[PDB]
Short mmCIF file of C-alpha atoms and ligand atoms in Angstrom, two decimals:
data_model
loop_
_atom_site.label_atom_id
_atom_site.label_comp_id
_atom_site.label_asym_id
_atom_site.label_seq_id
_atom_site.Cartn_x
_atom_site.Cartn_y
_atom_site.Cartn_z
CA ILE A 8 -90.94 -39.25 53.07
CA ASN A 9 -89.04 -42.38 54.28
CA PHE A 10 -90.76 -42.36 57.25
CA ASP A 11 -93.46 -45.03 58.11
CA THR A 12 -96.83 -42.98 58.28
CA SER A 13 -97.78 -46.13 60.60
CA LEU A 14 -96.51 -46.07 63.01
CA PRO A 15 -97.62 -41.79 64.02
CA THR A 16 -100.57 -44.28 64.71
CA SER A 17 -99.79 -46.50 67.68
CA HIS A 18 -98.80 -44.62 70.15
CA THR A 19 -95.56 -46.56 70.91
CA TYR A 20 -94.94 -44.25 73.16
CA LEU A 21 -97.38 -45.91 75.34
CA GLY A 22 -95.43 -48.91 75.40
CA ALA A 23 -95.34 -51.46 72.91
CA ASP A 24 -97.40 -54.62 74.04
CA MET A 25 -101.35 -53.61 74.19
CA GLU A 26 -104.53 -55.89 74.75
CA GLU A 27 -107.06 -54.77 71.90
CA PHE A 28 -110.18 -55.39 71.57
CA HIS A 29 -111.79 -55.93 68.28
CA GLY A 30 -116.13 -56.36 69.04
CA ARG A 31 -117.56 -52.76 67.69
CA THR A 32 -120.66 -51.66 69.96
CA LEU A 33 -123.29 -49.08 67.97
CA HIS A 34 -125.74 -47.74 69.85
CA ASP A 35 -128.74 -47.16 68.29
CA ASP A 36 -130.08 -43.77 66.82
CA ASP A 37 -132.51 -41.68 69.27
CA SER A 38 -131.26 -43.82 71.95
CA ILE A 39 -130.49 -42.30 75.54
CA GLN A 40 -128.07 -43.94 77.05
CA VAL A 41 -126.29 -43.22 80.33
CA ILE A 42 -122.06 -43.57 79.59
CA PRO A 43 -118.56 -42.54 81.97
CA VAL A 44 -117.31 -38.68 80.36
CA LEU A 45 -113.89 -38.65 80.60
CA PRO A 46 -112.08 -36.28 83.57
CA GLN A 47 -109.47 -34.04 82.58
CA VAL A 48 -108.85 -34.06 79.38
CA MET A 49 -111.46 -30.55 77.24
CA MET A 50 -111.12 -31.81 73.73
CA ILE A 51 -114.01 -31.57 71.19
CA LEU A 52 -113.43 -35.11 69.77
CA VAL A 53 -114.29 -36.28 66.17
CA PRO A 54 -115.83 -39.53 64.77
CA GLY A 55 -113.04 -41.81 63.78
CA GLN A 56 -110.22 -39.44 65.22
CA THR A 57 -107.98 -41.15 67.87
CA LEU A 58 -108.24 -41.12 71.58
CA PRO A 59 -103.88 -41.56 73.29
CA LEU A 60 -105.10 -41.94 77.25
CA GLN A 61 -102.74 -42.03 80.82
CA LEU A 62 -104.87 -42.67 83.88
CA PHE A 63 -103.04 -42.23 86.72
CA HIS A 64 -105.81 -41.56 89.66
CA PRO A 65 -107.00 -44.46 91.65
CA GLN A 66 -110.73 -43.14 90.58
CA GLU A 67 -109.97 -42.70 86.90
CA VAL A 68 -108.31 -46.18 86.70
CA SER A 69 -111.75 -47.63 88.80
CA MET A 70 -113.14 -46.11 85.56
CA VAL A 71 -111.66 -47.10 83.73
CA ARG A 72 -111.77 -51.05 85.06
CA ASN A 73 -115.26 -51.12 84.94
CA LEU A 74 -115.47 -49.92 81.53
CA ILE A 75 -113.46 -52.38 79.97
CA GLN A 76 -115.98 -55.17 82.00
CA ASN A 77 -118.58 -53.05 80.33
CA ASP A 78 -119.22 -51.38 77.33
CA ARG A 79 -115.48 -50.15 76.81
CA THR A 80 -117.12 -46.74 75.46
CA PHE A 81 -117.28 -43.67 76.81
CA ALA A 82 -118.04 -39.81 76.33
CA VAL A 83 -115.90 -36.44 75.04
CA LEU A 84 -118.13 -33.31 75.71
CA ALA A 85 -117.98 -30.22 73.40
CA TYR A 86 -117.68 -27.70 75.65
CA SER A 87 -118.12 -23.62 74.89
CA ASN A 88 -117.80 -22.55 77.69
CA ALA A 94 -121.23 -29.03 77.82
CA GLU A 95 -124.65 -29.71 75.64
CA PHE A 96 -123.35 -31.77 72.27
CA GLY A 97 -120.49 -34.58 71.83
CA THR A 98 -118.82 -37.95 70.34
CA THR A 99 -118.63 -41.23 72.28
CA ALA A 100 -115.33 -42.90 73.06
CA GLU A 101 -114.54 -47.48 72.49
CA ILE A 102 -111.20 -48.73 73.94
CA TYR A 103 -109.24 -50.50 71.88
CA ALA A 104 -106.57 -51.30 73.10
CA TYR A 105 -105.51 -51.71 76.77
CA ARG A 106 -102.53 -52.06 78.96
CA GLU A 107 -102.18 -51.93 82.64
CA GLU A 108 -98.24 -50.54 83.98
CA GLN A 109 -97.33 -50.38 87.26
CA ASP A 110 -94.33 -47.83 88.73
CA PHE A 111 -93.50 -47.44 92.01
CA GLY A 112 -96.88 -49.45 93.35
CA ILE A 113 -98.84 -46.08 90.86
CA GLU A 114 -100.99 -48.43 89.16
CA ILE A 115 -100.50 -46.41 85.28
CA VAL A 116 -103.09 -47.61 82.49
CA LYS A 117 -103.12 -46.70 79.48
CA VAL A 118 -105.61 -46.76 76.15
CA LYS A 119 -105.86 -45.98 73.35
CA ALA A 120 -109.50 -44.70 72.37
CA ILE A 121 -111.58 -44.06 68.60
CA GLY A 122 -113.80 -41.70 68.00
CA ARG A 123 -117.70 -43.65 67.35
CA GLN A 124 -120.33 -41.66 67.72
CA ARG A 125 -122.29 -37.71 68.47
CA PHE A 126 -124.25 -37.29 71.61
CA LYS A 127 -126.70 -34.20 72.94
CA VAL A 128 -126.37 -33.95 76.11
CA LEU A 129 -129.26 -34.69 78.02
CA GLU A 130 -128.58 -34.89 81.89
CA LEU A 131 -125.13 -34.71 83.75
CA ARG A 132 -123.86 -36.48 87.16
CA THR A 133 -120.98 -36.59 89.25
CA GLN A 134 -120.63 -38.89 91.23
CA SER A 135 -119.25 -39.47 94.86
CA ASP A 136 -115.46 -40.81 93.00
CA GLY A 137 -115.74 -37.70 90.82
CA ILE A 138 -115.95 -38.74 88.23
CA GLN A 139 -119.16 -37.03 85.78
CA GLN A 140 -121.60 -39.15 84.52
CA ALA A 141 -123.99 -38.25 81.41
CA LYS A 142 -127.05 -39.12 79.99
CA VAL A 143 -127.29 -38.86 76.30
CA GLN A 144 -128.92 -39.47 72.78
CA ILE A 145 -127.64 -40.23 70.13
CA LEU A 146 -127.33 -37.84 67.30
CA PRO A 147 -128.44 -39.63 63.73
CA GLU A 148 -125.80 -39.53 60.10
CA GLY A 149 -128.09 -41.13 58.22
CA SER A 150 -127.55 -41.17 53.81
CA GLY A 151 -126.93 -39.67 50.09
CA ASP A 152 -123.70 -39.24 48.46
CA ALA A 153 -121.93 -35.52 47.34
CA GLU A 154 -118.87 -36.67 45.71
CA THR A 155 -119.03 -33.03 43.81
CA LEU A 156 -118.09 -31.30 47.25
CA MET A 157 -116.14 -34.25 48.27
CA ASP A 158 -113.59 -33.71 44.80
CA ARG A 159 -113.44 -29.66 45.10
CA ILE A 160 -112.47 -29.95 49.26
CA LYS A 161 -110.13 -33.34 47.26
CA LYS A 162 -108.46 -30.51 45.23
CA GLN A 163 -108.35 -27.44 47.48
CA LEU A 164 -106.62 -29.83 50.32
CA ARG A 165 -103.90 -31.21 46.59
CA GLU A 166 -103.57 -26.88 46.30
CA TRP A 167 -102.80 -27.25 49.87
CA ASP A 168 -100.35 -30.30 50.06
CA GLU A 169 -99.24 -32.42 47.21
CA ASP A 174 -106.40 -42.65 48.34
CA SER A 175 -104.80 -41.02 52.63
CA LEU A 176 -109.23 -39.80 52.42
CA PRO A 177 -112.23 -41.84 52.93
CA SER A 178 -114.15 -41.70 49.74
CA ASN A 179 -117.43 -42.28 52.80
CA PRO A 180 -119.64 -38.66 52.90
CA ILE A 181 -119.67 -39.38 56.72
CA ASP A 182 -116.76 -40.54 56.92
CA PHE A 183 -114.74 -37.45 54.68
CA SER A 184 -116.79 -35.13 56.67
CA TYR A 185 -115.15 -36.20 59.52
CA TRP A 186 -111.94 -35.83 58.51
CA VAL A 187 -111.42 -32.39 56.88
CA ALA A 188 -113.79 -31.89 60.57
CA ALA A 189 -111.03 -32.42 61.98
CA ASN A 190 -107.95 -32.23 60.39
CA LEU A 191 -108.23 -28.37 59.40
CA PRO A 192 -107.02 -25.71 61.37
CA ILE A 193 -109.77 -23.75 62.08
CA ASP A 194 -111.76 -22.44 65.61
CA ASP A 195 -112.78 -24.58 67.84
CA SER A 196 -116.03 -23.03 67.34
CA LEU A 197 -116.11 -24.46 64.73
CA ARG A 198 -115.27 -27.99 65.04
CA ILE A 199 -118.74 -27.57 66.82
CA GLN A 200 -120.91 -26.40 64.25
CA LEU A 201 -119.60 -29.29 61.67
CA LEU A 202 -120.50 -31.38 64.85
CA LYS A 203 -123.97 -29.78 65.06
CA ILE A 204 -124.67 -30.60 61.32
CA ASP A 205 -126.73 -33.84 61.01
CA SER A 206 -126.25 -34.29 56.88
CA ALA A 207 -122.68 -35.08 55.60
CA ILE A 208 -123.91 -32.39 52.39
CA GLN A 209 -124.70 -30.22 54.49
CA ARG A 210 -121.45 -30.53 56.73
CA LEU A 211 -118.91 -30.89 53.21
CA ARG A 212 -120.49 -27.87 52.21
CA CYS A 213 -119.35 -25.71 55.42
CA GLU A 214 -116.08 -27.54 55.44
CA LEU A 215 -115.06 -25.84 52.05
CA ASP A 216 -117.11 -22.00 52.79
CA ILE A 217 -114.01 -22.30 56.33
CA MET A 218 -111.04 -24.11 54.49
CA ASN A 219 -112.02 -20.67 51.45
CA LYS A 220 -112.02 -18.70 54.81
CA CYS A 221 -109.55 -20.14 55.87
CA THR A 222 -105.05 -17.73 57.14
CA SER A 223 -102.85 -17.84 59.02
CA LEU A 224 -102.40 -19.31 61.87
CA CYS A 225 -101.69 -17.48 65.17
CA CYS A 226 -99.75 -16.90 68.60
CA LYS A 227 -102.72 -17.01 71.52
CA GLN A 228 -100.78 -15.08 73.83
CA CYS A 229 -100.40 -12.86 71.68
CA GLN A 230 -102.48 -12.65 68.70
CA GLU A 231 -98.96 -10.87 67.50
CA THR A 232 -97.56 -13.43 64.99
CA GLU A 233 -98.13 -15.66 62.46
CA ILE A 234 -96.57 -18.56 62.87
CA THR A 235 -97.11 -20.54 59.99
CA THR A 236 -100.53 -21.16 56.80
CA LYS A 237 -102.53 -23.30 55.20
CA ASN A 238 -99.86 -24.08 52.63
CA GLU A 239 -97.78 -25.79 54.61
CA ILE A 240 -99.70 -28.22 56.53
CA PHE A 241 -97.94 -31.66 56.09
CA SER A 242 -99.66 -34.83 57.37
CA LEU A 243 -96.76 -37.34 58.67
CA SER A 244 -99.75 -39.93 59.45
CA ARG A 245 -102.51 -42.19 58.00
CA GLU A 246 -104.75 -40.19 60.38
CA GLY A 247 -104.04 -36.73 59.10
CA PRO A 248 -102.09 -33.59 58.87
CA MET A 249 -103.96 -33.61 63.01
CA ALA A 250 -103.31 -35.38 65.56
CA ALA A 251 -103.87 -36.09 69.12
CA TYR A 252 -101.03 -36.78 71.48
CA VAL A 253 -100.52 -37.68 75.17
CA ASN A 254 -97.22 -36.49 77.01
CA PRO A 255 -96.17 -38.03 79.84
CA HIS A 256 -98.54 -36.83 82.46
CA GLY A 257 -101.73 -37.80 80.66
CA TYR A 258 -102.13 -33.71 78.97
CA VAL A 259 -102.95 -34.88 75.26
CA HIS A 260 -102.56 -32.17 72.86
CA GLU A 261 -103.44 -32.34 69.37
CA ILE A 262 -100.83 -31.42 66.67
CA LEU A 263 -100.66 -30.16 63.59
CA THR A 264 -97.54 -30.82 61.47
CA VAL A 265 -96.11 -28.63 59.52
CA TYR A 266 -92.62 -28.06 57.36
CA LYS A 267 -92.63 -24.42 58.56
CA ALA A 268 -93.07 -22.69 60.96
CA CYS A 269 -91.89 -18.96 62.24
CA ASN A 270 -91.43 -16.49 64.92
CA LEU A 271 -90.48 -19.96 66.69
CA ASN A 272 -87.55 -20.30 69.12
CA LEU A 273 -85.26 -23.41 70.01
CA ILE A 274 -85.00 -24.15 73.77
CA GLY A 275 -82.81 -26.79 75.12
CA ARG A 276 -81.59 -29.52 72.87
CA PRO A 277 -83.19 -31.74 71.09
CA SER A 278 -84.72 -34.64 72.68
CA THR A 279 -85.82 -37.86 71.31
CA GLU A 280 -87.97 -39.44 74.86
CA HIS A 281 -91.11 -40.03 74.74
CA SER A 282 -91.23 -38.59 71.75
CA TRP A 283 -94.74 -39.26 69.79
CA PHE A 284 -93.28 -39.32 66.25
CA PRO A 285 -90.11 -42.39 66.18
CA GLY A 286 -86.64 -41.65 64.75
CA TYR A 287 -86.71 -38.35 65.79
CA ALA A 288 -86.25 -36.11 68.15
CA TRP A 289 -88.51 -33.14 70.19
CA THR A 290 -87.09 -29.28 71.23
CA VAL A 291 -89.67 -26.88 72.25
CA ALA A 292 -90.13 -24.19 70.66
CA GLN A 293 -91.62 -21.20 72.15
CA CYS A 294 -92.89 -17.35 70.51
CA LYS A 295 -90.05 -14.64 69.50
CA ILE A 296 -92.45 -12.98 70.89
CA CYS A 297 -94.58 -12.98 74.69
CA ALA A 298 -92.01 -16.67 74.84
CA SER A 299 -95.01 -19.17 74.79
CA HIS A 300 -94.87 -22.74 73.99
CA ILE A 301 -96.24 -23.55 70.69
CA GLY A 302 -94.74 -26.31 70.62
CA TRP A 303 -91.76 -28.35 69.39
CA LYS A 304 -89.47 -29.12 66.75
CA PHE A 305 -89.11 -32.91 65.83
CA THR A 306 -85.25 -33.61 64.45
CA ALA A 307 -84.14 -36.98 62.46
CA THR A 308 -81.69 -38.99 64.04
CA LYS A 309 -81.08 -40.31 61.19
CA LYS A 310 -79.01 -38.48 57.58
CA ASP A 311 -81.43 -41.58 56.41
CA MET A 312 -85.33 -39.26 57.09
CA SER A 313 -86.64 -38.11 53.95
CA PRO A 314 -88.49 -35.54 56.59
CA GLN A 315 -85.24 -34.15 58.16
CA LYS A 316 -87.24 -31.70 60.06
CA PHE A 317 -90.40 -31.32 60.94
CA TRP A 318 -92.92 -28.22 62.87
CA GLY A 319 -96.26 -29.77 65.96
CA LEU A 320 -98.07 -27.25 66.97
CA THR A 321 -100.60 -27.41 69.57
CA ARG A 322 -104.14 -26.33 68.15
CA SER A 323 -104.52 -24.78 71.90
CA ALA A 324 -101.59 -22.24 71.31
CA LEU A 325 -102.91 -21.72 67.97
CA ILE A 326 -105.46 -18.98 67.09
CA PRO A 327 -106.47 -18.19 63.59
CA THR A 328 -106.43 -15.38 61.72
N1 QFC B 401 -99.68 -41.13 89.16
C1 QFC B 401 -98.59 -40.66 89.01
C2 QFC B 401 -97.30 -40.61 88.26
C3 QFC B 401 -97.75 -40.68 87.51
C4 QFC B 401 -96.34 -39.69 85.78
C5 QFC B 401 -95.02 -40.19 85.94
N2 QFC B 401 -94.38 -39.62 84.65
C6 QFC B 401 -94.45 -39.27 83.96
C7 QFC B 401 -92.58 -39.55 83.46
N3 QFC B 401 -91.97 -40.27 82.71
C8 QFC B 401 -90.31 -39.83 82.97
C9 QFC B 401 -90.28 -38.47 82.26
C10 QFC B 401 -89.79 -37.54 82.80
C11 QFC B 401 -88.98 -36.95 81.68
C12 QFC B 401 -89.07 -36.15 80.44
C13 QFC B 401 -89.33 -34.74 79.46
O1 QFC B 401 -90.19 -34.28 78.75
C14 QFC B 401 -91.24 -33.53 79.03
C15 QFC B 401 -92.08 -33.04 80.25
C16 QFC B 401 -92.91 -32.97 80.54
C17 QFC B 401 -93.83 -32.79 79.81
C18 QFC B 401 -93.28 -33.49 78.14
C19 QFC B 401 -92.60 -34.63 77.75
C20 QFC B 401 -91.99 -34.54 76.26
N4 QFC B 401 -93.30 -33.75 75.69
C21 QFC B 401 -93.96 -33.32 74.17
C22 QFC B 401 -92.51 -33.16 72.86
C23 QFC B 401 -92.62 -33.77 71.14
C24 QFC B 401 -92.94 -34.94 71.70
O2 QFC B 401 -92.82 -35.59 70.64
N5 QFC B 401 -93.26 -36.08 72.64
C25 QFC B 401 -93.46 -35.78 73.55
O3 QFC B 401 -94.17 -36.79 74.66
C26 QFC B 401 -94.16 -32.67 76.61
O4 QFC B 401 -95.55 -32.26 76.14
C27 QFC B 401 -90.50 -37.17 80.07
C28 QFC B 401 -90.53 -38.75 80.38
C29 QFC B 401 -92.10 -41.21 83.85
C30 QFC B 401 -93.80 -41.62 84.48
C31 QFC B 401 -95.17 -41.72 87.35
F1 QFC B 401 -93.27 -42.18 87.20
C32 QFC B 401 -96.51 -41.42 88.00
ZN1 ZN B 402 -97.05 -14.67 71.42
#
């Protein structure tokens, strides 16, 4: 590729002038902490994963302002339909105004996992969560990490973590799997146990389908390509604050193209998106990205929403 695999990770569609916070905050294990809960996101965050956010409502804008004064850390719960979650630490901040509307744009990172002990909704409607920090641990597993990396090569072609705990959350966050399996991987405390399950999951992986119809195969594990350092799967925020997880793939099937290619708010700079819908149900599965210059090495790719896809 000729693209910069570090620009998808900068989220420059959010504005190119953000504050940076370098400090870190790691709570101790078994510790019990009260943290604000992100109000609209319904995702399963993995430690290491990056969360882009676009906040408009006064209640949400004031919260994030109190987080910057305090820990800059909040809670993202894993919903079975919320007994576990992950913490997210803001590392970049930017305040905007549009027609007298205060917009906040934040970039956050998954940090530590937790088990919800108690929940509270407050006067502003923003929920708060009393969580016990779950532990990670020690140990090594090089045989496993190498067998998992052998399989990932038979799928696509040191962009991969070298630490068992870090590698385990990279597969957790980048494998094409159901949210029921992401939770299972998040309920484990040892990395060795997680890398094992993750190797089974991918040996039993299948094509991905349209979730609305369960009748069209859109793509497979062997078409996944990484155009970003983060990985083949990355979260992005649309113009209305809706965060999507996107699988980047070279070929997608059973999709129709609606509209003319556009560059506005593109998550992949230099490219242009066109809505792709299922050929049978017409449900929005994602977008087809196309290059604005003939010199760009990946001239076309697909970005598919993990929300519109179900494993076969
Ligand atoms: N309170 C308050 C408040 C809140 C929000 C305000 N405004 C929001 C809109 N902004 C102007 C605008 C208009 C129209 C468009 C067309 O594009 C759209 C439209 C709808 C959904 C999606 C996309 C693109 N897209 C993906 C495709 C893949 C990719 O690469 N990137 C993406 O984003 C989507 O999912 C873009 C920007 C101006 C600000 C505000 F003015 C006040
Ligand atoms: Zn369909």
